[PDB]
Enzyme design. Structure first.
Site, PDB file in Angstrom:
ATOM      1  N   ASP D  40       0.789  -1.351   0.048  1.00 51.50           N
ATOM      2  CA  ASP D  40       0.004   0.062   0.057  1.00 51.50           C
ATOM      3  C   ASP D  40       0.681   1.144  -0.067  1.00 51.50           C
ATOM      4  OD1 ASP D  40      -2.767  -1.011   0.160  1.00 51.50           O
ATOM      5  OD2 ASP D  40      -1.784  -1.723   2.313  1.00 51.50           O
ATOM      6  N   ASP D  65       9.927  -8.619   2.407  1.00 52.08           N
ATOM      7  CA  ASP D  65       9.939  -8.838   3.967  1.00 52.08           C
ATOM      8  C   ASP D  65      11.579  -9.236   4.238  1.00 52.08           C
ATOM      9  OD1 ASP D  65      10.616  -9.701   6.557  1.00 52.08           O
ATOM     10  OD2 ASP D  65       8.753 -10.892   6.880  1.00 52.08           O
ATOM     11  N   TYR D 158      17.579  -1.887  20.344  1.00 51.38           N
ATOM     12  CA  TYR D 158      17.607  -1.035  19.464  1.00 51.38           C
ATOM     13  C   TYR D 158      19.189  -0.452  19.107  1.00 51.38           C
ATOM     14  CZ  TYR D 158      16.482   3.049  15.973  1.00 51.38           C
ATOM     15  OH  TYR D 158      16.765   3.894  14.929  1.00 51.38           O
ATOM     16  N   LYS D 162      21.843  -1.808  16.322  1.00 52.59           N
ATOM     17  CA  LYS D 162      22.518  -0.695  15.471  1.00 52.59           C
ATOM     18  C   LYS D 162      24.072  -0.790  15.496  1.00 52.59           C
ATOM     19  CE  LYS D 162      19.222   0.940  12.649  1.00 52.59           C
ATOM     20  NZ  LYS D 162      18.077   0.739  13.388  1.00 52.59           N
ATOM     21  N   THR D 193       9.942  12.584  11.668  1.00 51.88           N
ATOM     22  CA  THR D 193       9.067  11.808  10.802  1.00 51.88           C
ATOM     23  C   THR D 193       7.680  11.658  11.759  1.00 51.88           C
ATOM     24  OG1 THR D 193       9.685   9.759  11.738  1.00 51.88           O
ATOM     25  CG2 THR D 193      11.082  10.453  10.049  1.00 51.88           C
TER      26      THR D 193
END
Ligand SMILES: [Cl-]
Ligand SMILES: [Cl-]
Ligand code: NA
Ligand code: NA
Lengths: 275, 274, 274, 275
Positions: D40, D65, D158, D162, D193
C-alpha cells in the site's frame, strides 16, 4: 581484593577462558557455578576445580544451553539460591561458526552465531541482573573479542555480534549503576587455548598475529582471568561501562589477515566479493 | 608484584599521586615522588613513611616537569636508587582556566599545553629509556574524563589530556617490543582538595550525580587501585588501553558548569558572543 | 550554497588547502588564503584566478598562525571583505621529525605543538568570534589519519592532531547554540609534493597500499570534496564529527616506516633502546 | 556529483527517511527501486515519487520482507536486471519494538528486533554486494542510529543491534574495498518523521533532547538524505568504512532520558532493575 564467601556464575566454564576464570575464583575462596552445553566437560572441570580451593572454595555445575532462556533463568535461580546472593558473573559462553567472505556467508551459521552471542548474552544479563539488583549490587563481566575492536576480514558474524555485546554491557551499566551493579566488557586478543591451536601454532597466521602485536608473546587464559577477577573485585568498585582489551596491544595495529589460510580454498577474487 | 620493585610517581605530593604512592609503599615498593611544591612533597613523605613496613620506602625530589633536564635528573635519581626503574605513574598536570573558547586566556592555554603535552612527553621519553634498558616496565599516564567527553568551557584541559592519551597509545605501539607497557587512566570526578567548588554548589553537584550511573563520587583509592593493577604482573598482557575510572560518567556526558559560569561571563558569552 | 559567501582557508598556498580554495572559487565563493610563504600564496592566487567566474574571487594574506595577533588580523581582513565570514577550512600545520619517542627532538616537538595545537586554537578562537556575531557558519579542521591510528615514530604529529580533533568537538559543543558547526576531517595518504619519500620507496608504498582497502592513493580533490560538503547547507545538521577520507585505512593500521628508519636509527633504537 | 543514469536500491523506501532518500535520487535523475513490507505504502510512494524526476528519474517498487533472505535476493536481482548494473544501496529498513528495563525486556520483541536489524541488514548487504562487485564498484550506505553511539537507557535491542550494523558496515568496507565497493554508516539523531511525532512534540522528551543537542533544532529527513546522497556520489569516492552522525551534535552530550514517559508506567525501581 578478597573473594571469600562470595558466589559467582561463570558461563562457558567447562573449557578455555571460562575454566580459567572459574579456577581463579575457586582458588581465591569463592563459590562458583559453571554452566555450559556439555555435561561431560562440566563434570570433568568440577572434579579438577575441586582440588584447588582447599582455601574455602566451592564448585558446582548445571548443564545449560544459553540459547534457551528458561535454562539460563533456572541456572541463575540455582546459583542465587545456593547461599542467597549472587555477587557476580563472568560470561564467556559464545562462539563463532563463520569463516569466509560476507558475499558467500552461510546464513544459518550466521543466525546461530547471532542467537548464541546476542540473545544468549541478553538472557544471562537479564536474569543475573535481577538478582544482583535485589542483592544490593554486584559485578557483571562480559567476554567479548578483539574482533569487535578491529575488523577481522572474513570472520562474518563474530565481530558483528561481539560489537553488539559490548554495546549491551555499556547500556546495562548505564541502566543498572543506580543499583550498584557494574557491567564491563573484556576483549581478549589471541589467547592460547586448545580451541585455537590451529591458528596459534600455524606459521603464516602466528606470524601475521605477531606482526600485529606490540608485546612479543601470545596471550594466556590467566591474562583474561586476572582482568575478570580485578573487575569483579572491590578494587574496581568505581569502574563500570568500560570495554577493555587484553591483547598485547594488538588493537593499536590491525586485525589478522587470514589470506594464507583462505586464498587456496576460496581464491583471491571471492575474498573481495565476486561470486 | 610490588615488593622488590621501584616506581616513580609524578604529582605525588597530594591527591591522586599521593594515593598511588601510599598504595605502592603499603605493598612494599620503593617510591620516589616528584612535583613542583617541595613543602607538600616533604609532608607526603612524612605521612607515607607511616605506611612503614612491608618494607616499603619513599623519597622525594622537587621537579618542574616543564623542564626536560630536571625531569631527566629525577629519572636518573629513581633509577640509581636500587638500579632499576619498574614503572611510572604520571599524575603531574592540571589546567588554569574555565571560560568560552572565544575568550581563551592564550598564556594560560600555552601553560596548560606545556605542562600536560610537553611535560608528559619528557617523563615518558626518559622513563622509557631506562625501562627499555632494564628489560621492561609499566607506564601509567593519568588523563581525565575531560578527554573522553567534551567539558564545555574547560578549554585546554580536555584538549591536552586527549593529546596525552594518544601519546600513551603511540608509546605502547613503539615500546611493546621492549616489554614496556603504556596505558592511560581517565578519572571521573574524584574527591580531593581540588574539587571544593563543585562540592559547595548544589547545581554542579547535582549535575555530576545525574551524569554518573554509580551513585557516589570517586575516591583517590579508586584511581590508585587501577594504577596498581596496571603496574602489576596481573596486567602483563595489557597495553595501549585508555580506561575510565568514573562511575560510568563517560556513558552519559561531561558536566555543565553553566550555573557557575553564567554570572561571570553571561549566557551569550558562553555560546561564543563577544 | 557557495555563491554569495566568503571563506578563510589556512595553508591555502599548496596541497590540500589549495585544492579546497580552488573548489570554492570554482563554485563562485570569495576565498582568502593565508599561510607562511608569501611566494607560494601569491602563486596560488594567480593560478586560482584562472577558475575565473562563477563570479569567484581569491585574495591572500601572509600569516604566521603561531602568532595570535597576525591570525586575528587575517580574520579581520576576510570578515571586512564582504562583511561576513561564512566558514573556515584550517589546513595550516604539519610536523618536523620522524624518530623514536626515546629520541624525540624536543625543540621540534614544541614547534609542532605550537603550530598544531596553539595555531589551531587561535584560528578557531577568532574565526568563531565573527561567525557567532554573523549568525552562524561552518568550521572544518584538517587533521590526519595519524590521529586515528598510531603511526610509529611520528612523535608529535598524531599527538597534536588528536588534540585538534578534541578541540573541534569541544568547539561544536560550545558553539552550536550560535549555529556555528565545527567538524574535523582526517585525510589518509594524499598525493602531494609532501609525499615524494613514500612515493620513491617500494617498501613504504607497498605498506600503505596493504593498509588501504580502496586500491588507490588519495587526491587533494577527495579532501576538498568533503570540506565543501561540510561547509555547505547540505551538512546543516552535521557538527562535532571527525571523519576520515582515507580509502578505509583507519580500518587497518597506521603505516610502518621501518624500512626507511632502520638504516638511520637501527632496529634497537626503534623499540626505544638508547 | 551526478546521479543521472545510475540505479539504486532503497530499503524502507515507503516512508520516513527511506522515502526522502528515494525522493532525492529520483529528483536528481536516478533510477530507484524502493522495497519494504507494505505494498500500500510502496505503491503510494511510487505514484508520488513519479511526479518528481521529470529530470529523467525512474521509480519502481517490490514488496519485500527483509527477514526472509530469498525475498531480499529477488529484489536485488530485479533492481540489477533493470538496467544491468546496481550503483548503490541505502538501507533504511529496520525497527524497534522494545521500551523498558533490560531486566524485564520482552525476549520475543528483542529477538524480532535482532532478526530485522542484524540478519535483515546482512541479507541486503550480502546480495547487493555481489552485484556491485560484479559491476566494478558502487556504494552501500547503512542507516544506523545515535542509539548506537550513545546509550539510550531502556531502548533495549535498538542500540545493541544498530551497533552490530555499524560494525558490519566497517567489516564489509574492509573486505570489499579491493572491489571498489564503499560501505559506510549514517547514525541520525532525532529526525522529524510521522513515526516519532509522539517524542518530537512531547514537552518533557522534546526538552530533554534539546538540552542534549548543540544545534538549536530537530533533524529533518532531508538532512539524512543529503548525507546519503553525498556518500553515494563520486564526491565521496575515497570515503569508506566511516560511521557518521547527522544529529545536531547530540553525540557530544548524552542519549535521551525517557524517565518522564516511563516512570509512571514502570516505577523508578524497575528502571534501575528490581523486578
Ligand atoms: Cl606534587
Ligand atoms: Cl600555504
Ligand atoms: Na621492598
Ligand atoms: Na560570489
Amino acid at each position: 581484593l578478597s573473594f571469600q564467601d562470595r558466589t559467582y556464575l561463570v558461563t562457558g566454564g567447562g573449557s578455555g577462558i571460562g575454566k580459567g576464570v572459574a579456577a581463579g575464583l575457586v582458588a581465591a575462596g569463592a563459590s562458583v557455578m559453571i554452566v555450559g552445553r556439555n555435561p561431560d566437560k562440566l563434570a570433568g572441570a568440577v572434579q579438577e576445580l575441586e582440588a584447588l580451593g582447599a582455601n574455602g572454595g566451592a564448585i558446582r555445575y548445571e548443564p545449560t544451553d544459553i540459547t534457551n532462556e528458561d535454562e539460563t533463568a533456572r541456572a541463575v535461580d540455582a546459583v542465587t539460591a545456593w547461599h542467597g546472593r549472587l555477587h557476580g558473573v563472568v560470561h564467556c559462553a559464545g562462539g563463532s561458526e563463520n569463516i569466509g567472505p560476507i558475499t558467500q556467508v552461510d546464513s544459518e551459521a550466521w543466525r546461530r552465531t547471532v542467537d548464541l552471542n546476542v540473545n544468549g548474552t541478553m538472557y544471562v544479563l537479564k536474569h543475573a541482573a535481577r538478582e544482583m539488583v535485589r542483592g544490593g549490587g554486584g559485578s557483571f563481566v562480559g567476554i567479548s573479542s578483539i574482533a569487535a575492536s578491529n575488523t577481522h576480514r572474513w570472520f562474518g558474524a563474530y565481530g558483528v555480534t561481539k560489537s553488539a555485546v559490548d554495546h549491551l554491557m555499556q547500556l546495562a551499566a548505564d541502566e543498572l549503576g543506580a543499583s550498584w551493579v557494574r557491567v564491563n566488557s573484556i576483549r581478549p586478543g589471541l589467547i592460547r587455548t586448545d580451541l585455537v591451536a590451529a591458528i596459534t601454532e600455524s606459521a603464516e597466521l602466528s606470524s601475521d598475529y605477531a606482526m600485529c602485536t606490540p608485546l612479543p608473546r601470545q596471550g594466556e587464559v590467566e591474562d583474561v582471568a586476572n582482568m575478570a577477577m580485578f573487575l569483579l573485585s572491590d578494587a574496581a568498585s568505581f569502574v563500570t561501562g568500560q570495554v577493555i582489551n587484553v591483547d598485547g596491544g594488538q588493537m593499536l595495529r590491525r586485525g589478522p589477515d587470514f589470506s594464507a589460510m583462505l586464498e587456496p580454498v576460496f581464491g583471491r577474487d571471492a575474498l573481495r566479493g565476486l561470486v
